[PDB]
Amino acid sequence: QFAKPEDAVKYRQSALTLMASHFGRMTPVVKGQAPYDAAQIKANVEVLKTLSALPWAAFGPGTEGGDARPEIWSDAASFKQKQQAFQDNIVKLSAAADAGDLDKLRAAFGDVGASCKACHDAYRKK
Amino acid sequence: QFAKPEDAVKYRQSALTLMASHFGRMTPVVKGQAPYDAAQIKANVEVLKTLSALPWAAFGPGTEGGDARPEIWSDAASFKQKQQAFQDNIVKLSAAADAGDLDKLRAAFGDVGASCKACHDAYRKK
Numbered sequence: 481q482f483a484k485p486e487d488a489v490k491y492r493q494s495a496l497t498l499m500a501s502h503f504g505r506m507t508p509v510v511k512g513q514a515p516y517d518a519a520q521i522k523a524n525v526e527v528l529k530t531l532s533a534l535p536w537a538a539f540g541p542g543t544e545g546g547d548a549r550p551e552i553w554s555d556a557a558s559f560k561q562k563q564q565a566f567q568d569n570i571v572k573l574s575a576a577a578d579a580g581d582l583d584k585l586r587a588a589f590g591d592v593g594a595s596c597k598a599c600h601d602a603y604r605k606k
Numbered sequence: 607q608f609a610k611p612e613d614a615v616k617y618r619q620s621a622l623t624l625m626a627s628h629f630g631r632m633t634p635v636v637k638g639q640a641p642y643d644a645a646q647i648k649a650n651v652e653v654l655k656t657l658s659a660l661p662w663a664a665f666g667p668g669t670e671g672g673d674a675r676p677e678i679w680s681d682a683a684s685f686k687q688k689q690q691a692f693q694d695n696i697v698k699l700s701a702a703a704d705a706g707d708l709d710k711l712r713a714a715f716g717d718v719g720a721s722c723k724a725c726h727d728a729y730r731k732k
């Protein structure tokens with residue numbers, strides 16, 4: 481869907497900004513500093529689930545740029561495994577949110593965060 | 607969810623970038639220059655539906671900036687009506703996509719585009 485590689489870069493950077501806001505805005509909730517409204521969180525995690533599938537299609541062939549390391553492309557299978565592990569952790573966060581249990585949410589939230597950082601450590605430029 | 611107004615501006619600008627890509631990438635389809643796969647479009651419009659609800663929460667009180675005209679805030683009811691008309695047109699586009707009919711899709715698509723432009727004409731800086 482991108483006329484030029486710059487358009488894919490702009491897309492993924494916007495997707496990731498959204499995704500970071502929808503994830504990160506839950507930090508006060510999982511820390512107990514903001515109240516836990518199970519329906520609020522369920523709806524937010526549904527938005528996060530949609531967003532979290534979006535970046536990966538915007539690292540298509542020829543879309544080198546931004547803060548993406550070139551190894552995303554030369555080690556495609558290993559990058560796919562980090563994105564699929566992350567996505568699987570988003571499924572687990574959805575399950576916790578759908579269950580309405582703050583203990584499970586905070587554990588699932590931590591797992592997702594770990595998965596974000598693991599990918600960045602390997603595939604995001606410093 | 608925004609620590610500073612700049613964060614709301616960044617959020618809405620990212621949401622709108624996404625939303626423009628998910629809308630605009632259908633232009634070749636509705637013009638007949640790309641093939642019409644009803645399931646592909648249905649899935650894309652589902653993503654667009656999620657995205658199209660996101661910008662409006664990021665024009666909260668005190669979030670003046672970007673290319674947003676100040677009248678978004680001083681004429682709040684009229685801005686809400688443009689966003690709700692747009693959202694209603696997104697419902698109609700979902701219906702057309704869910705029906706699998708290219709004639710209905712192209713009409714609904716045109717209505718959505720008109721609604722984007724109408725809002726920009728009143729509420730987006732030049």
Ligand code: HEC
Binds near residue numbers: 545595599600
């Ligand atoms: C690989 C499978 C990743 C996972 C999982 C997550 N992120 Fe990521 N992120 C990745 C890359 C390769 C890049 C660089 C993209 C580019 O072309 O520049 C990023 C970048 C970000 C950013 C900065 C975005 C910007 O506006 O420029 C943020 C804020 C970010 N990533 C956040 C984020 C979060 C919150 C994640 C888990 C919920 C997450 N990322 C996962 C690769 C990967």
Ligand code: HEC
Binds near residue numbers: 625723725
């Ligand atoms: C008001 C109800 C709007 C509707 C409906 C749509 N848009 Fe919009 N748009 C609006 C404003 C007030 C602004 C400025 C936001 C800011 O703070 O800068 C915008 C901006 C855009 C942009 C530029 C985004 C950027 O990255 O800076 C684009 C590409 C855009 N809008 C696209 C777009 C499309 C495709 C729409 C219908 C599907 C649409 N907008 C509707 C206000 C409103």
Ligand SMILES: O=C1O[C@H]([C@@H](O)CO)C(O)=C1O
Binds near residue numbers: 500503504597600
């Ligand atoms: O909100 C975020 O969480 C992850 C990471 O900090 C988790 O360790 C990330 O990159 C964000 O922007």
Ligand SMILES: O=C1O[C@H]([C@@H](O)CO)C(O)=C1O
Binds near residue numbers: 626629719723726
């Ligand atoms: O794809 C887009 O469509 C609308 C408008 O051009 C429709 O007239 C807009 O502002 C976009 O970025």
